[PDB]
Amino acid sequence: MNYPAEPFRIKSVETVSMIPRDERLKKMQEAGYNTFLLNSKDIYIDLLTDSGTNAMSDKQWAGMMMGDEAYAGSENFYHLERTVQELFGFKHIVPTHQGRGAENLLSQLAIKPGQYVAGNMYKNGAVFVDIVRDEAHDAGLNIAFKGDIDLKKLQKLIDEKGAENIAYICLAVTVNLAGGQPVSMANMRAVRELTAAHGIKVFYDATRCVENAYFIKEQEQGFENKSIAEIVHEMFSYADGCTMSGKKDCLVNIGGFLCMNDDEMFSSAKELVVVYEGMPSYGGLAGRDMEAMAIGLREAMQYEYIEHRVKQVRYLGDKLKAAGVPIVEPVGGHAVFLDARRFCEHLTQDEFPAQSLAASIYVETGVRSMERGIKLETVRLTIPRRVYTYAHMDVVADGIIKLYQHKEDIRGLKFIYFFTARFDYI
Amino acid sequence: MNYPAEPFRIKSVETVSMIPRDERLKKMQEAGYNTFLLNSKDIYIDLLTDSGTNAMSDKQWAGMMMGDEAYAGSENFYHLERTVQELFGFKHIVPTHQGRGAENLLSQLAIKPGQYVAGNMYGAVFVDIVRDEAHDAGLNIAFKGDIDLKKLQKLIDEKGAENIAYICLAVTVNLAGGQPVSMANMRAVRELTAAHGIKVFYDATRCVENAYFIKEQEQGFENKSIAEIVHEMFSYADGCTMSGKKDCLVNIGGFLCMNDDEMFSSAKELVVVYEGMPSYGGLAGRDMEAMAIGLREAMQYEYIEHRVKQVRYLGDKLKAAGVPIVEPVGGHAVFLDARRFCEHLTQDEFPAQSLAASIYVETGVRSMERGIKLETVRLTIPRRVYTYAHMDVVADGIIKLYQHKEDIRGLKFIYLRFFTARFDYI
Amino acid sequence: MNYPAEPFRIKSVETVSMIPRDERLKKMQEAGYNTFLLNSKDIYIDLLTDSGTNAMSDKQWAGMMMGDEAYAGSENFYHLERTVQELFGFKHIVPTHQGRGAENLLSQLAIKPGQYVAGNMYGAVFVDIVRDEAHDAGLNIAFKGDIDLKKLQKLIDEKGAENIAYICLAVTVNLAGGQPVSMANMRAVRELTAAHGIKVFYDATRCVENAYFIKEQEQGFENKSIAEIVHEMFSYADGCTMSGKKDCLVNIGGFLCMNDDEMFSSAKELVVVYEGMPSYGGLAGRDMEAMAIGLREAMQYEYIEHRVKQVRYLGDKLKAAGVPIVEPVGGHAVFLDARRFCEHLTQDEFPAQSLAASIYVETGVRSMERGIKLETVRLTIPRRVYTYAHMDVVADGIIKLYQHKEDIRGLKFIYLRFFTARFDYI
Amino acid sequence: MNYPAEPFRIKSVETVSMIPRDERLKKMQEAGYNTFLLNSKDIYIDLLTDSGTNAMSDKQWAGMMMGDEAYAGSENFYHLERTVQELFGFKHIVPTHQGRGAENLLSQLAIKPGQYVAGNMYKNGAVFVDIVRDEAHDAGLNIAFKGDIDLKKLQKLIDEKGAENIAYICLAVTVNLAGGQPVSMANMRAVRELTAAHGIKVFYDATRCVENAYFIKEQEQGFENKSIAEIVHEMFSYADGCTMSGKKDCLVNIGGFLCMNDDEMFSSAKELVVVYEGMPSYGGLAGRDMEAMAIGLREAMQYEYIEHRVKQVRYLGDKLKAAGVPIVEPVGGHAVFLDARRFCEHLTQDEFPAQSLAASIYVETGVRSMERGIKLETVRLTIPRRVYTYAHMDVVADGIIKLYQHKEDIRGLKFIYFFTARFDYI
């Protein structure tokens, strides 16, 4: 139909308690109506985040059994190095345990104090200039590649601040607003030409780059018949490097990396490792983990894997939408946001409608959701890769639909004291 | 709807090729239109058997990392013995590498030459005492697996009390893809047999699937646990033999359980007389551990309700579309009626094999032609491996083929004759 | 010195209790001075058998994570078939769950009732054609396992050519803990037998251990690879049966290999006639993968030289201290002469059992009383599990006991009678 | 004897290539005589560092199979939290992926610019005052607990800078100089009293705290009969918290943690996580890794495990020492340093004697060592936990002894261009 069956079989499961409502209420009480303080063993479906809770393949698990734990010269590192080179086309790679990690070196490495960094990604040394196209900012409405950079604004910045004062342009693919919005291959190539004209560097935040690639393949004219791998290799052809949190699109539970083409930039990058470590290593990334990341990255290239990933989120969004549930449109490639203000018009900001909606979803279904501030009150439903089925999406949708039909019953809360905050029903 | 979402999350996946129709046709041609000859790597969904392709949990995998491989006094053996004692309520257990190994140990311990054996599912003479309806495939009757008490009485009477080794009760019984045996039938058989001092041994291979049926259908058990039903089932038996490969959620193993102290000693000597030293009959410590853990997981109501209903979901969708299926749907398989499906073909024009071949080409699903005699195509479902979406791939494929039954060409031999036979279209 | 350091690093360990002498005595008492009755958790070093307690490599563990558990067309089966074809040079392979399962499949395929079988290691009549020295335990002669060609000729002659099923060659032969068979003996036996059209099947269980001996002792093989020796060994046979649990570095599995096309078909039908469907005879896909990988690892010269020399190291230290041992030392075990050790006791006062009991109390090492008849204590060594330091714990313990042989009290029964027997001091 | 056999069995191995000398020379050439540029697959024994290459138990590996990957409320985190609380007696724990990580928060958390930090551990905001006792600084000579803080110097600092200007006292146990030197329980308790008298905080660098505990148990009067666990719990009773790199003494490949008792300090610590992450998590530490760390920490408490750890290093040191090899005394608990200046008096600093010694050790034995600057030229031999045997220590010793006896042959090198530095033989 519109929704493809999973392009894999289950190799192993994680059993669940399957605690009833009365029990879920107790737990919810004890967590003080704060979903973020719920124990993992008490949740059926955990949609808190799409970061690090991916299900790995049996291939990745075989790879975890072959960790070459040398401090240096690890064969797992060559594996990863070769994979990134081949798929992303970047010369050098500096592995980190976190994306944040990769992000730090680059900044250190590429920003002189009082220089500018601009990007589509909405303060130390640098000033960030949000250069996204203005209807990126928008909700409800649809412009396909909402995260595209506004070339007039980029050109303008260049004009009035000088190319010399621009550290680099940072383009996130996909950009993480409204559940991840795509960037066109057309805009990536335009950006490369304008910037290159002024000797400006371009770094991508490649975290959900496979998600981006699917959007391109699916909706950008001329890419209909290209491989995800072909799209991925071309996207990166327009950047000087990238930073990646492998915990998202690499189908791993940990890892990140910093990539570049620049010899010099590279050299220096290793130095900073040395200054921060004393000895250059794998940024405290086990050999087994580099191996699993290398295998996961290639697995991410299967079209059926990413099509199914995106449409599962799509499916939840659709189901919610066609029942009248107040959701934020357009639906991203990795999360669905409930509109808490519309959901609970009866409660005011002061009675924490999102917080309270999150609590009810859990009491009714065994589903954990995250309260938001995206500044509208949204309850986020973020979906990890390969962990859940459509039947699991049905559990989530059905319960929210029934909640919605009784929205009036959702009671407000009071701070009987945040990720630490404890509350009580007013 | 009527069907529960999986009571588990996916911990790891097995990646699949997802080869297109064009390559499937070719592989089919190459396999000689014999699905038994297809390679595992070329199969999307493999419904050939429910035996041994079960997905283990992460707890089962943690057990696999801790096998105590001592030849004697293994911690794993103790865990397995405890577990079975507690849930089956059998005093003694003889681990084996296969169901079939436990059986032949029983047959060689409990039968005197020329003695009869009587049961619901098929030296020695085999007497079939299952009620007559067991034999009617189109008839939707509950607990079709029940033994005919009168047929028992007749056997008892004409041959006498010790001309009978024992009575063999298979739960569920493997005709029509697992038909249950009511507890009432089990309490009955015991009674009649214990009076004459006769022995009853159960084939516990799909005993949890049977338990689910009793709890779901046998007026009186609605509020009894799966563990409570199981425990009582075996209170009406002298022992059982179990193939772990089925309801224990493991890929290998079985065991022989008895209550009789003597028989146990005889049994044990018979292992020392086959091996040299008493063993765990070619069962690794890691395997006894995973099997112990799996028996326990098999007892969660939500697990088994989900298991049986996923099968029923497949059955219902076929049923409601007019696809001729065996009834009632069993606990682990759905059988298509190939004769009625392909009325245009002849036993001679091999309707089952051709049906099975077309199914594969159309969907990437492997089924095996069968007979239970009746000419069927068996869709056997492994535990915790597939989803509802996977059931749909299977269901939609068969329905489209059904809507063109007439287009299914017949086959001829172009050469046991089952597992190796090659065919060509007519 | 004379003994190589391990050709491997430790990837993971198995933790041990390290219980003191006082608690060991008690456990011994509780086990009734029967080491067979000790619990695995109470043992420091377990030298009961070399069968199945082998340590697998991380490559073998990566294989275990990738079992393709399809009932037919498993990728694992293909890997295993390739591997054996290539190294053993046998055309066909029938996987089995045990060595013993492969054997009985052979015996039931290659023997006609009343036929004799002849070999070096012990319906049907068993003729022992090994040279007479094989039988002298105190005699240090090389290649003690060789078949007496004249004894063969005599058997051939008095009973005639087809009154003989086949000739059974065990390499190494399991008397004196693994005595080798020279290639020359193997080329000879073939010759004589192929003339009369007679069949030779090898018991390849410890075939790599045999290869090491040939390469080390048989003038001519010094520069031939372990793989080259192995390959040629099996060029003199019709097939073999192998217990994977020994030289394949796995905890379970075996196989039947033949060259004969017909026999293979018969064999295969005999699995379909025991199972219903041709199987992998209760061998998981993960297991065929680990066994394939293990055969290959068994071929590294450094692995097997280390294996055999670690055993020899134990032998040398006993030897040089005056401890009465069986000679020459075999490829996988050292046997103490209990009669000579404990000259003060009588067959009646159970010298072996008491020796084995004292060893345990003193060192935390489990050995088993044996007979090969001669009354010994067998110290069997698993592959890649222990170190030289572990050999020392064993060696020093026995030497201290030796220096007080006289203090070893005799035992009596306070009750097969082997595996369950309980004793008390005299 | 003086050297205990390993208090464990091998569960799995990592196979090695076992490349010969001529091949090792080539590799050495290609690495440009820089051991730090050697591939892991080409090394037999890798003594580069004692950081992160520990062999985990089968218990830890079972624990890696049970990773609860929730972003929050992970059961693995409770596991670890409970273990640290029980063993170290600290209230709160903030897990990190690296020790360095833990180190960073504390600094941020506990140092006001221009405050002092003093410790036994030889510049941002703070001034470090080395307060070790002066014969800590020493080589050759022996004072048992060489890392003890000089109380007169601590008192003096307090006197002239003011208690208010001291951020905290940092005590590393063991201190990492000369391969790790111990601190007395007597000195830890003295420090707590003096500091506490002035309201000064004390933080320990607990990285090799189990190593420390052994030294105390072994050489500090009154601890002879205390448990390692009893010693460990008491050491921590004298500190406000600690930072730990679990990669050392926790027998893991990754992880660290920051511990404290202070409610407030704790609260704030979480905030910093939030400022650096956005959401409080496990400092980017997988659930499987926290689980493995929890189990490893407890395993570290086995006396026989740590005694054997320390004496293995001791054994190498001893063997080297009794042959006349120039080593740095006293021998630490985790490494042996070769004196390169004395080893190669024929080469000058300018011809990089350490660098060149490291290269020769590798060419001759297949052993990788690290060039040092500890400012004497030393070649470091650092030993990972549970990976190597005494036979492996013999390989290392024997080769260095023969090198030593030919020291004159070691040729100097020239920079034909550091951890990146390539050289050539002059």
Side-chain angles (χ1 to χ4, degrees), chain C residues 12-81:
Chain C
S12 68
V13 308
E14 215 186 322
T15 62
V16 296
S17 57
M18 303 301 291
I19 65 157
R21 210 187 101 99
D22 30 295
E23 295 200 35
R24 288 206 299 271
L25 194 20
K26 181 209 297 191
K27 299 299 200 315
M28 192 71 266
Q29 289 202 35
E30 302 197 68
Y33 308 110
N34 193 344
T35 57
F36 198 92
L37 298 177
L38 288 164
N39 292 142
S40 184
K41 51 150 190 130
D42 294 325
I43 305 166
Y44 179 15
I45 295 169
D46 198 0
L47 311 183
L48 176 68
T49 184
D50 74 313
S51 182
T53 166
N54 296 317
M56 298 195 292
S57 60
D58 62 3
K59 281 128 184 202
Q60 289 184 292
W61 281 97
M64 299 276 282
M65 297 312 303
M66 279 178 322
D68 164 5
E69 309 296 342
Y71 199 79
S74 169
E75 201 185 275
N76 310 303
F77 180 64
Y78 300 141
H79 305 346
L80 174 66
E81 201 187 36

Side-chain angles (χ1 to χ4, degrees), chain A residues 36 39-40 48 53 61 64 68-73 78 97-98 100 253 276 279-280 284 288-289 368 370, chain D residues 36 39-40 48 53 61 64 68-73 78 97-98 100 253 276 279-280 284 288-289 368 370:
Chain A
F36 192 88
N39 296 330
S40 194
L48 191 77
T53 180
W61 274 103
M64 298 272 300
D68 174 336
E69 305 298 342
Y71 196 75
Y78 296 144
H97 46 284
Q98 275 188 311
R100 171 47 252 166
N253 304 126
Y276 288 74
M279 207 173 162
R288 52 173 194 265
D289 295 308
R368 163 160 74 189
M370 162 82 146
Chain D
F36 192 88
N39 296 330
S40 194
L48 191 77
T53 180
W61 274 103
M64 298 272 300
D68 174 336
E69 305 298 342
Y71 196 75
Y78 296 144
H97 46 284
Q98 275 188 311
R100 171 47 252 166
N253 304 126
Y276 288 74
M279 207 173 162
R288 52 173 194 265
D289 295 308
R368 163 160 74 189
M370 162 82 146

Side-chain angles (χ1 to χ4, degrees), chain A residues 236-253:
Chain A
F236 287 118
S237 70
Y238 306 121
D240 297 292
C242 73
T243 63
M244 197 167 179
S245 165
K247 281 187 192 145
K248 276 66 168 191
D249 276 346
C250 294
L251 286 168
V252 282
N253 304 126

Side-chain angles (χ1 to χ4, degrees), chain B residues 12-23:
Chain B
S12 68
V13 308
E14 215 186 322
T15 62
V16 296
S17 57
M18 303 301 291
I19 65 157
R21 210 187 101 99
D22 30 295
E23 295 200 35

Side-chain angles (χ1 to χ4, degrees), chain C residues 5-18 40 43-46 55-59 61 65 297 300 302 384-390 393 396, chain D residues 1 5-18 40 43-46 55-59 61 65 299 302 304 386-392 395:
Chain C
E6 299 86 4
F8 57 69
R9 311 192 183 166
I10 293 155
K11 178 65 183 293
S12 68
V13 308
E14 215 186 322
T15 62
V16 296
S17 57
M18 303 301 291
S40 184
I43 305 166
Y44 179 15
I45 295 169
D46 198 0
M56 298 195 292
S57 60
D58 62 3
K59 281 128 184 202
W61 281 97
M65 297 312 303
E297 290 183 12
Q300 170 183 31
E302 294 73 0
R384 302 192 298 195
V385 180
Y386 306 103
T387 84
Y388 282 123
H390 292 136
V393 166
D396 308 345
Chain D
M1 267 114 150
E6 300 81 5
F8 50 80
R9 310 183 183 176
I10 298 161
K11 180 64 188 291
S12 64
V13 314
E14 183 167 4
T15 58
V16 298
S17 56
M18 298 304 275
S40 194
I43 304 163
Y44 178 22
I45 304 160
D46 190 7
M56 293 197 295
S57 64
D58 61 344
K59 265 134 188 178
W61 274 103
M65 303 306 279
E299 291 181 12
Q302 203 195 177
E304 296 85 351
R386 312 195 290 198
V387 178
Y388 305 104
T389 78
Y390 289 119
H392 292 139
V395 166

Side-chain angles (χ1 to χ4, degrees), chain A residues 57-299:
Chain A
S57 64
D58 61 344
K59 265 134 188 178
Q60 284 182 289
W61 274 103
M64 298 272 300
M65 303 306 279
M66 289 196 300
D68 174 336
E69 305 298 342
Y71 196 75
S74 177
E75 251 219 85
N76 317 126
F77 171 75
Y78 296 144
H79 295 173
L80 172 74
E81 196 200 37
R82 284 128 204 199
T83 297
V84 174
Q85 268 164 2
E86 178 178 348
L87 304 181
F88 294 16
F90 290 124
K91 216 178 168 301
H92 313 307
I93 173 178
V94 169
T96 64
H97 46 284
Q98 275 188 311
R100 171 47 252 166
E103 295 162 32
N104 177 246
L105 309 167
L106 164 160
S107 338
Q108 291 195 260
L109 247 175
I111 312 182
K112 313 238 152 221
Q115 273 191 321
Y116 286 89
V117 155
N120 62 344
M121 40 184 264
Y122 326 16
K123 64 92 194 169
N124 179 232
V127 183
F128 171 83
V129 211
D130 167 62
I131 60 175
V132 76
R133 70 146 101 225
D134 221 304
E135 340 98 290
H137 287 299
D138 147 84
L141 178 275
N142 299 255
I143 189 284
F145 299 88
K146 211 166 174 159
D148 277 6
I149 267 180
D150 180 306
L151 257 41
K152 173 165 127 199
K153 292 183 208 169
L154 164 63
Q155 174 70 46
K156 159 212 210 152
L157 178 71
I158 302 208
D159 276 2
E160 55 197 77
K161 272 90 157 208
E164 55 174 77
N165 304 335
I166 297 160
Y168 65 82
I169 302 321
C170 185
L171 221 141
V173 286
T174 57
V175 59
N176 200 28
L177 57 99
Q181 291 313 140
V183 180
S184 46
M185 180 87 73
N187 183 250
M188 283 176 250
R189 182 169 177 173
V191 181
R192 168 67 314 165
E193 295 301 344
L194 175 29
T195 58
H198 305 64
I200 306 178
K201 271 192 153 207
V202 178
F203 298 104
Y204 289 2
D205 170 357
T207 295
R208 302 176 179 85
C209 74
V210 173
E211 207 176 274
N212 201 90
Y214 165 86
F215 279 110
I216 282 177
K217 178 163 170 73
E218 191 190 57
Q219 296 199 309
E220 196 170 8
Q221 193 171 343
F223 295 94
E224 308 82 12
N225 287 290
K226 331 233 75 219
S227 269
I228 286 289
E230 297 168 318
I231 295 145
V232 166
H233 194 108
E234 191 181 348
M235 307 176 26
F236 287 118
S237 70
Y238 306 121
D240 297 292
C242 73
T243 63
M244 197 167 179
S245 165
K247 281 187 192 145
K248 276 66 168 191
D249 276 346
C250 294
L251 286 168
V252 282
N253 304 126
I254 36 148
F257 52 73
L258 165 77
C259 290
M260 81 273 282
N261 281 315
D262 189 26
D263 271 358
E264 269 168 26
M265 156 136 190
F266 180 44
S267 258
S268 183
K270 293 153 68 193
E271 178 184 26
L272 256 60
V273 153
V274 158
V275 165
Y276 288 74
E277 291 195 64
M279 207 173 162
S281 201
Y282 306 135
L285 191 70
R288 52 173 194 265
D289 295 308
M290 293 189 284
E291 193 65 14
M293 212 185 342
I295 298 168
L297 190 57
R298 297 201 183 264
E299 291 181 12

